[PDB]
């Protein structure tokens, strides 16, 4: 991650998990942050339960209350499909 | 829910406007902004951008999205890097932040097997010159100890050899 505040001094302790499921998984957590941070529109497609479960660990207690989320329940699909788009 | 002592917290290390940050707690959320944007970019802050991704199983990514990301941001800056924990994991995240980090860290591996999960520890210090260095990192070391540490607080163990 890389910030205008990278010219502040920090010490910071992580626990961190196993480092087999850091190497397994990092890059797609990195994705899914990177595009809720930012986004000004997610779309969730997936399971009726799955998708709820996500918009409200992306809204943060409304520290996302600005993102305009649209869910899609669907039925036959195994997993959450994320649309994140973003313009000025 | 956190305890107030356990809460992150800036702290003017020096006469500089620039204070430091003091996470020593593992408490800073990413999700937060109240503490700066240490965590994202703004090379995509207002680039018109279109993707579409699967995202991870939900319990799964709960449980990961924290430290992966601090570690990301925070690990990548560091100048002093230490890794607490098993032989097998902290050589695991050796090799992981050694790669990751742009600034030269050093590295210290601290083995303690009795820690089922690894714990890193991120400094980085503001702006012969090797003295300074080990200096001001005795100071955080300091002031993470007397300050901001409860005697028995075990998350700390790794700042006290």
Known sequence: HMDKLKDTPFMVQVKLPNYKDYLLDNKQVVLTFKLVHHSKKITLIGDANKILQYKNYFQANGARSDIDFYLQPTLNQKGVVMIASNYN | ?161
């Open chain 2, 1 to 161: 829910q956190i305890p107030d002592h356990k809460k992150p917290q800036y702290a003017s290390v020096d006469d500089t406007k620039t204070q430091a940050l003091f996470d020593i707690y593992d408490t800073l959320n990413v999700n937060d902004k109240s503490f700066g944007d240490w965590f994202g970019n703004s090379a995509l802050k207002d680039k018109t951008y279109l993707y579409a991704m699967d995202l991870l199983d939900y319990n799964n990514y709960l449980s990961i999205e924290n430290p992966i990301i601090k570690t990301r941001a925070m690990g990548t800056y560091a100048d002093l890097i230490i890794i607490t924990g098993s032989l097998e994991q902290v050589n695991g995240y050796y090799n992981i932040l050694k790669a990751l980090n742009k600034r030269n860290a050093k590295f210290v591996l601290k083995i303690n097997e009795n820690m089922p999960y690894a714990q890193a520890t991120f400094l980085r210090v503001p702006k012969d010159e090797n003295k300074l260095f080990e200096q001001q990192k005795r100071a955080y070391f300091n002031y993470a100890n007397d300050v901001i540490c409860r005697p028995n607080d075990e998350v700390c163990s790794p700042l006290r050899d």
